[PDB]
Design an enzyme around this catalytic site. Structure first.
Site, short mmCIF file in Angstrom:
data_model
loop_
_atom_site.label_atom_id
_atom_site.label_comp_id
_atom_site.label_asym_id
_atom_site.label_seq_id
_atom_site.Cartn_x
_atom_site.Cartn_y
_atom_site.Cartn_z
N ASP A 83 -13.43 -11.02 5.92
CA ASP A 83 -12.23 -10.64 6.67
C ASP A 83 -12.50 -9.39 7.52
O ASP A 83 -11.68 -8.47 7.58
CB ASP A 83 -11.03 -10.41 5.75
CG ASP A 83 -9.71 -10.42 6.50
OD1 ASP A 83 -9.66 -10.96 7.62
OD2 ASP A 83 -8.73 -9.90 5.95
N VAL A 88 0.85 -1.18 0.00
CA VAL A 88 0.00 0.00 0.00
C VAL A 88 0.89 1.23 0.00
O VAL A 88 1.85 1.31 0.77
CB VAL A 88 -0.95 0.03 1.21
CG1 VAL A 88 -1.67 1.36 1.29
CG2 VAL A 88 -1.95 -1.10 1.12
#
Ligand SMILES: O=P(O)(O)O[C@H]1[C@H](OP(=O)(O)O)[C@@H](OP(=O)(O)O)[C@H](OP(=O)(O)O)[C@@H](OP(=O)(O)O)[C@H]1OP(=O)(O)O
Ligand SMILES: [Cl-]
Ligand SMILES: [Cl-]
Ligand code: NA
Ligand code: NA
Ligand code: NA
Ligand code: NA
Length: 337
Positions: free
Chosen positions: A150, A47
């Site tokens: 998740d 990221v």
């Protein structure tokens, strides 16, 4: 087993909607986005904070590490189907290194603190608000035929100044098809539902509601994680030491499941513990009767008996949050008029 709600979403909608493995990705111009600095530390992706070269508006760049090509298309397809939904992270573009085709996902910039770091500072009321806003995301994606699979504090990004919440990281998300048996290798250990731990493969949206319940328990009781297992087997032990083994056996008997003897030896036998056991002078201010009733209706072995996201949003626990949203919108309308 079949979901109590949203059962037919992917039967009503065309094959093109849920057939991600046949997705035609109209990639964008990789040159349009410039990385600025790294941020994330993950095994599925990297990221970076970035900017649009032209508009200069910030953005988040997520470069997907080597994974099955099918996992890339699944995440993109799900992000596309959910794009624009309430509190879903917004996918703006998908590009790829035009020599290795390594995909990068371009998201709206997320000027947020992590739920795990933020909630120790939040008031009772702001916990209700953010849980409610997370429920809005989960009801939306469930209503679009998708399980997130998740849900956990790291995947809830909040800008506390602007009171904005986003549900992120759709890499494990999947389309719900009634009757389908899914892989149980989803979710993070502390938030895995009993269905994953006893190999009930035809699970559904309600898996996300167990994970939410785990988060909620950890928040209002100031115990993180609430169910602190050292592996997937011990995770079921830790749940059984709270919910009890009678309800576990009734659940196993209802769905014709059997535990491996090695696991049954570890689970043993345990009484149900009342939720009040976890109340202390230091978390008392977060644990109202309504909070316990809400939590009790999420953390149930039987996934069919857990609240749906919509039912959760309707619980008395959010009564004040709902009144605030009703009032906020009515005022916004008049200000526009
Ligand atoms: O038993 P394996 O040879 O390891 O194959 C498995 C299995 O596929 P089968 O049903 O064909 O046996 C999984 O299928 P489900 O359990 O989801 O039905 C699939 O699951 P995912 O693709 O969702 O992960 C998994 O994939 P993975 O490679 O990620 O473990 C895949 O493995 P292969 O694609 O290498 O066969
Ligand atoms: Cl759990
Ligand atoms: Cl549900
Ligand atoms: Na932004
Ligand atoms: Na952030
Ligand atoms: Na279950
Ligand atoms: Na207190």
């Amino acid at each position: 087993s079949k979901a109590r709600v949203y059962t037919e979403v992917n039967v009503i909608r065309p094959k093109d909607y849920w057939d991600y493995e046949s997705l035609i990705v109209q990639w964008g111009e990789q040159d349009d986005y410039e990385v600025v600095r790294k941020v994330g530390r993950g095994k599925y992706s990297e990221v970076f904070e970035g900017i649009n070269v032209n508009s200069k508006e910030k953005c988040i760049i997520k470069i997907l590490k080597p994974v099955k090509k099918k996992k890339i298309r699944r995440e993109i397809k799900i992000l596309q189907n959910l794009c624009g939904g309430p509190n879903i992270v917004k996918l703006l573009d998908v590009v790829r290194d035009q020599h290795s085709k390594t995909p990068s996902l371009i998201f709206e910039y997320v000027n947020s603190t992590d739920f795990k770091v933020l909630y120790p500072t939040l008031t009772d009321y702001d916990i209700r608000y953010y849980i409610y806003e997370l429920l809005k995301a989960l009801d939306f994606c469930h209503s679009q035929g998708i399980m997130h699979r998740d849900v956990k504090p790291h995947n809830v990004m909040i800008d506390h100044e602007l009171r904005k919440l986003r549900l992120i990281d759709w890499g494990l998300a999947e389309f719900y098809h009634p009757g389908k048996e899914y892989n149980v290798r989803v979710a993070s250990r502390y938030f895995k539902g009993p269905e994953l731990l006893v190999d009930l493969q035809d699970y559904d949206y309600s898996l996300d509601m167990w994970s939410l319940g785990c988060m909620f328990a950890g928040m209002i009781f100031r115990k993180e994680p609430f169910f602190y297992g050292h592996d997937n087997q011990d995770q079921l032990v830790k749940i059984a030491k709270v919910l009890g083994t009678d309800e576990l056996n009734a659940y196993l008997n209802k769905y014709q499941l059997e535990l491996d003897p090695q696991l049954e030896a570890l689970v043993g036998r345990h009484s149900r513990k009342p939720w009040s056991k976890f109340i202390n002078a230091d978390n008392q201010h977060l644990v109202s009767p309504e909070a316990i009733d809400f939590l009790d209706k999420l953390l149930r072995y039987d996934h069919q008996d857990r609240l749906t996201a919509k039912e959760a949003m309707a619980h008395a626990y959010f009564a004040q949050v709902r009144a605030a949203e009703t009032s906020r919108m009515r005022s916004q309308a008049a200000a526009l008029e």
